[PDB]
Write an enzyme that holds these catalytic residues in place. Sequence first.
Site, PDB file in Angstrom:
ATOM      1  N   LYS A   5       2.732   6.199   6.078  1.00  0.00           N
ATOM      2  CA  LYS A   5       1.974   5.130   5.419  1.00  0.00           C
ATOM      3  C   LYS A   5       2.475   3.760   5.804  1.00  0.00           C
ATOM      4  O   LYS A   5       3.687   3.541   5.901  1.00  0.00           O
ATOM      5  CB  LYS A   5       2.118   5.258   3.902  1.00  0.00           C
ATOM      6  N   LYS A  20       0.214   3.850  -2.602  1.00  0.00           N
ATOM      7  CA  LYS A  20      -0.768   4.909  -2.414  1.00  0.00           C
ATOM      8  C   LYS A  20      -0.172   6.234  -1.929  1.00  0.00           C
ATOM      9  O   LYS A  20      -0.821   7.275  -2.033  1.00  0.00           O
ATOM     10  CB  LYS A  20      -1.872   4.448  -1.481  1.00  0.00           C
ATOM     11  N   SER A  64      -6.316   3.310   3.217  1.00  0.00           N
ATOM     12  CA  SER A  64      -5.813   2.652   2.005  1.00  0.00           C
ATOM     13  C   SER A  64      -6.904   1.969   1.196  1.00  0.00           C
ATOM     14  O   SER A  64      -6.743   0.837   0.739  1.00  0.00           O
ATOM     15  CB  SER A  64      -4.669   1.689   2.326  1.00  0.00           C
ATOM     16  N   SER A  77       0.818  -1.227   0.000  1.00  0.00           N
ATOM     17  CA  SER A  77       0.000   0.000   0.000  1.00  0.00           C
ATOM     18  C   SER A  77       0.850   1.275   0.000  1.00  0.00           C
ATOM     19  O   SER A  77       0.306   2.374  -0.130  1.00  0.00           O
ATOM     20  CB  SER A  77      -1.011   0.049   1.178  1.00  0.00           C
TER      21      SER A  77
END
Length: 352
Positions: free
Chosen positions: A210, A44, A107, A41
Amino acid sequence: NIKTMIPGVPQIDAESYILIDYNSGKVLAEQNADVRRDPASLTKMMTSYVIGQAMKAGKFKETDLVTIGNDAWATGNPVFKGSSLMFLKPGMQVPVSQLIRGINLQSGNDACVAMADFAAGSQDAFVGLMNSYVNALGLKNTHFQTVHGLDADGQYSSARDMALIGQALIRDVPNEYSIYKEKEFTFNGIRQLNRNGLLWDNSLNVDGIKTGHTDKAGYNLVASATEGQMRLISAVMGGRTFKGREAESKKLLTWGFRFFETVNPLKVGKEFASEPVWFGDSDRASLGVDKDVYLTIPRGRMKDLKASYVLNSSELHAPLQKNQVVGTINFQLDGKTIEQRPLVVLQEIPEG
């Protein structure tokens, strides 16, 4: 011996990592930082960077309504099976503000598609922009195929590149970056928490960035934290558990702050030196830098920092352009140059 000590780096339970100073760019510690890996992820982060750039450019606002199409229908696309989702359905009209929190906090893979179509017309065009920014940021070990990082056998990144994308988020799109410290948001009557558990660690000032995890990727985290105005970024890729990726990142960030400090010895436009000039409408040139100087040095040693300079040419001859490079500034500790920056003309000097 103490004054000049080089600290040992802690052992880190992860496949690769890096720790950098946001302001100076200095790499404080690294292992396998350029090895290409599954970003999970963390992809992202670049999705967010593109959206942030679009909003900064005024292409759209947080209050604008986005219509969800069949491509972002969570339960109409089994590619989304087992992944994080907002459960968007076709015909919903969702504010940008909610979708970008879906991407950043949750996410949400469906949210990524909805915003990709909104911002760039198609997923393919949006990925084009992601990769254009890969090139613009000079990343050597990153490539994207999808807007969410699902269904992307040929995508990859590295600890260094993900730290640099983090740096870019913070620097270039601060209004987008400010979302990552939010601990929760509500969508469709359902409160959604942030997976970055370091936001709840009261012993650090973590405000991003993140997390990600797959079987191929292991546990990934890009974190950033501040102590005053000093800011570090860590990227740990291929960590071992949810708790381990947090713990290992905390080890790095804490070590960084304990042993290093960022200093700002010179700002753009501040005269560092002056030298005679020939043929000019003034008799001397004012010399300094065209970009603020941030150095990362061993903590406590600011008192021992020395600076000096060298000139490329024997004489300065007008015309001199603004920001014309004429030499080098050497910053030294213990009689050794630790950092160099271009010495430039601060104000143009035309011929007399």
